[PDB]
Each structure stands twice: as structure tokens, then as C-alpha cells.
PDB file of N, CA and C in Angstrom:
ATOM      1  N   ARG B   1     -30.009   4.936 -23.054  1.00  0.00           N
ATOM      2  CA  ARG B   1     -28.590   5.111 -23.340  1.00  0.00           C
ATOM      3  C   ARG B   1     -27.914   3.764 -23.578  1.00  0.00           C
ATOM      4  N   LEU B   2     -28.640   2.845 -24.204  1.00  0.00           N
ATOM      5  CA  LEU B   2     -28.111   1.517 -24.492  1.00  0.00           C
ATOM      6  C   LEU B   2     -27.782   1.371 -25.974  1.00  0.00           C
ATOM      7  N   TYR B   3     -27.004   2.312 -26.497  1.00  0.00           N
ATOM      8  CA  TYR B   3     -26.616   2.289 -27.902  1.00  0.00           C
ATOM      9  C   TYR B   3     -25.158   2.706 -28.072  1.00  0.00           C
ATOM     10  N   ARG B   4     -24.344   1.789 -28.584  1.00  0.00           N
ATOM     11  CA  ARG B   4     -22.927   2.060 -28.797  1.00  0.00           C
ATOM     12  C   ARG B   4     -22.724   2.984 -29.995  1.00  0.00           C
ATOM     13  N   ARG B   5     -23.616   3.957 -30.142  1.00  0.00           N
ATOM     14  CA  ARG B   5     -23.537   4.906 -31.246  1.00  0.00           C
ATOM     15  C   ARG B   5     -22.329   5.825 -31.086  1.00  0.00           C
ATOM     16  N   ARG B   6     -22.151   6.357 -29.882  1.00  0.00           N
ATOM     17  CA  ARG B   6     -21.037   7.253 -29.599  1.00  0.00           C
ATOM     18  C   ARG B   6     -19.768   6.463 -29.296  1.00  0.00           C
ATOM     19  N   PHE B   7     -19.812   5.666 -28.234  1.00  0.00           N
ATOM     20  CA  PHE B   7     -18.665   4.858 -27.836  1.00  0.00           C
ATOM     21  C   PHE B   7     -19.097   3.438 -27.481  1.00  0.00           C
ATOM     22  N   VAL B   8     -19.635   3.273 -26.277  1.00  0.00           N
ATOM     23  CA  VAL B   8     -20.090   1.967 -25.815  1.00  0.00           C
ATOM     24  C   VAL B   8     -21.490   2.052 -25.218  1.00  0.00           C
ATOM     25  N   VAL B   9     -22.106   3.224 -25.332  1.00  0.00           N
ATOM     26  CA  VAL B   9     -23.448   3.436 -24.805  1.00  0.00           C
ATOM     27  C   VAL B   9     -24.361   2.261 -25.135  1.00  0.00           C
ATOM     28  N   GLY B  10     -23.838   1.309 -25.901  1.00  0.00           N
ATOM     29  CA  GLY B  10     -24.618   0.145 -26.276  1.00  0.00           C
ATOM     30  C   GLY B  10     -25.494  -0.355 -25.144  1.00  0.00           C
ATOM     31  N   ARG B  11     -25.090  -0.062 -23.913  1.00  0.00           N
ATOM     32  CA  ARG B  11     -25.842  -0.489 -22.739  1.00  0.00           C
ATOM     33  C   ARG B  11     -26.133   0.693 -21.819  1.00  0.00           C
TER      34      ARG B  11
END
């Protein structure tokens, strides 16, 4: 869940 695809899930 380290992906800012949705919101900030970047991490």
C-alpha cells in the first residue's frame, strides 16, 4: 500500500 495512486498511499 505504498502507492499514492488513490490519495497518499504512496507509503
